[PDB]
Amino acid sequence: HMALTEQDFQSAADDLGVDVASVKAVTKVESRGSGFLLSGVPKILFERHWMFKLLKRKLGHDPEINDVCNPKAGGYLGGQAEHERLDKAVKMDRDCALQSASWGLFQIMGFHWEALGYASVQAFVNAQYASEGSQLNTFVRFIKINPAIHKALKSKNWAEFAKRYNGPDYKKNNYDVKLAEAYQSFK
């Protein structure tokens, strides 16, 4: 499958108005490294508590509870088996299921499709299948629609970036220091 090129990094850097070293640093620290499984489908993690929340909102009442639709988070099988979980959830409701997986290099939740400017959940999904460059573009859009994160990236304020991107427990995995060290390694 089409993996990340120097041009993918340069295009992303240009679109975000940051240096290439910043994009490589955030990719090294925040990505899954590869955006695709051996089978050629995008890497996903299926989030059954998002499936429960989104299908509840759609139906106006609680859906059936099972291993892929449950207010209790977890129950991961990992790797290719997450596609089997997605398939079971699609057979409950396709749009809720696709929105309840995290996709590609940066593990972006499908429920962000509309905010990210995709025409539909399906267009978001097609962008995950297209290439690693397309998945990096999903990440670019995510930064653009989050100006405070965008500004932290531009200013190389790794702690502010990690607090907003990784959340309040970012320091548990030292995300700020990993970003700073990665940046120095590429600069």
Residue numbers in the entry: 0 to 186
Task: Provide the authors' original text about this structure.
The structure of Pae87 shows that it is a one-domain protein with the typical α/β lysozyme fold.
When Pae87 was crystallized together with the hydrolyzed peptido­glycan sacculi, we expected to see a fragment of it bound to the catalytic cleft. Surprisingly, the peptidoglycan fragment (comprised of linked NAG, MurNAc, l-alanine and d-glut­amic acid units) was bound to α-helices 4, 5 and 7 on the opposite side to the putative catalytic pocket, in the same place in which a polyethylene glycol fragment was modelled in the apo Pae87 structure. The most important binding residues would be Arg93, Gln121, Asn125 and Tyr128, because they each make more than one bond to the ligand. Regarding the catalytic activity of Pae87, the disaccharide found in the soluble product bound to the crystallized protein (NAG-MurNAc rather than MurNAc-NAG) already indicates lysozyme activity, as described in the literature for this family. In the absence of a CWBD, this region may be used as a binding site by Pae87 and the other related lysins that contain it, perhaps performing a function in the endogenous lytic activity.
